[PDB]
């Protein structure tokens, strides 16, 4: 297919963008590159991070917290790196026993008030980033968790207040899960690298969303080193040779109805505004040497 994300730019009805995978791939570079390339043709784009690597500060040399702001060099770059532990710090006794009753309660309530802060403003689009999958993917099950929570407390200070609060959380999370499966404003991208296990857990994630009814069409890869003309490292040649072997299998599956984004590793951990602009520009014009 077309090796870019131009179709992600072209649909004006898009609202929500999901991006993830596993570690060791540098998802933050893809995140901020996607954000800045979206800022070229969009109005109000907000980034949000919950991964405990507080990486956007390292991306821009500026401390962020629990409130959005505009950062320098841009009129559209807004972000606030937050923590999921703040709601349990708000819990810091019976609600701890409720958190023992089901292995997850407070993270969904934090996610809910996060999304209320999200829908407080009038922003155009947003993007995401997450941890490893076993702690990530339970946010799709947060409606079933809150269904179990209300089924539990319906059998179990005034309890009517927390009943009406949990009912507001119920209707809000139902609107969020309903917005998830609409697919005209919610998309998902995944990343990986040329080795076995990185490719392995990728289809596990794809069939996971297949058993939840969310498709995709775009998959990004990383560190695809193409040889310099003339100059050669002898171990780099064998690394490229084995890299193409896993590359062509991903062609052997996803060339039908998916997109492949070739991205080479650069010599520096790309920071600075202009360097991130040049790094982001390659996600529209794909570089291809003769191979």
């Amino acid at each position: 297919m077309e090796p870019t994300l131009q179709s992600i730019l072209d649909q004006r009805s898009l609202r929500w963008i999901f991006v993830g995978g596993k570690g060791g791939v540098g998802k933050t570079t893809t995140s901020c590159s996607l954000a800045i390339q979206l800022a070229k043709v969009r109005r109000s784009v907000l980034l949000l991070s919950t991964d405990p690597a507080h990486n956007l500060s390292d991306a821009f040399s500026q401390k962020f917290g629990k409130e959005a702001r505009l950062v320098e060099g841009f009129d559209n770059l807004y972000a606030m790196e937050i923590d999921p532990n703040g709601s349990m710090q708000d819990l810091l006794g019976v609600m701890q026993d409720l958190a023992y009753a089901i292995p997850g309660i407070d993270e969904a309530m934090s996610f809910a008030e996060v999304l209320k802060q999200v829908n407080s403003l009038s922003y155009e689009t947003i993007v995401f980033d997450t941890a490893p999958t076993g702690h990530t993917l339970r946010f799709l099950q947060f409606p079933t968790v809150l269904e179990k929570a209300l089924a539990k407390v319906s059998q179990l200070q005034t309890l009517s207040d927390v009943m009406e609060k949990l009912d507001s959380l119920r209707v809000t999370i139902s609107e969020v899960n309903a917005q998830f499966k609409d697919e005209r404003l919610t998309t998902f991208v995944c990343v990986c690298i040329p080795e076995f296990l990185s490719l392995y857990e990728t289809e596990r994630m794809i069939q996971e969303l297949a058993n939840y009814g969310i498709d995709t069409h775009c998959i990004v890869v990383n560190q695809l080193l193409f040889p310099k003309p003339g100059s050669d490292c002898e171990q780099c040649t064998a690394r490229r040779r084995m890299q193409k072997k896993y590359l062509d299998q991903i062609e052997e599956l996803y060339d039908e109805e998916f997109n492949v984004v070739k991205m080479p590793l650069l010599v520096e951990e790309v920071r600075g505004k202009e360097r991130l602009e040049k790094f982001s520009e390659m996600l529209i014009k794909p570089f291809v040497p003769p191979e």
Partner: protein, 232 residues
Amino acid sequence: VEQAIELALEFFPALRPKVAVAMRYVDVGMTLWRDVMLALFVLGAVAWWRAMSLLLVIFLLELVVQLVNTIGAKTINNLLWRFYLSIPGSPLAKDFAEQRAKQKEYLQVRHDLNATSSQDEFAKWARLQRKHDKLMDELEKKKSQLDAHRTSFSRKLTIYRWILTRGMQWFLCFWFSSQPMFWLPYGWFPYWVEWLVSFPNAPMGSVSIVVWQSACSGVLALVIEAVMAVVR
């Protein structure tokens, strides 16, 4: 129940063998009562050879009570299994054969899966894995369908047999009750014992059909235990 925790709580308090001995003597009356019903069934059985149809009705009910004893509540449906391995016009056995056919493609693709390599056919690896979990969901759909139908079929045929059982367990006492089955010899039994006949409306001095209903199951039951000596 254990008579040991009851003794563990008997220490909390500070006669009893008199009732313990006085209770055990009552079972002798019921054992010799069934022994005299055994002797009267022997004398009722001898009287038929030298000499009607209702006794043959009880004769079939003895084999019904025997099947009640050697009941397999699953093994009746084990007879229903070969009952439904017979009919080609069965709608359900068609999908049962499609179930076994899908099991054949399941084990076939699983052989092609484990025979394949995870290195150089990774696209075929994933296509096999997708077909694997494709069929894995439709597998137990039939386990939910047919085993539901099977337990409903059991719930039908339990009552279907139970009508044939208790309809004869209550018809015999409804009809041909006043009509005397046979006359007891004059003077063998006290007046109060003869009363049993009087309550179901049959004339005094004849017997009803209860001990023939219930206690004749014990008559063949020892012959049932005779078979317990045959195989074992």
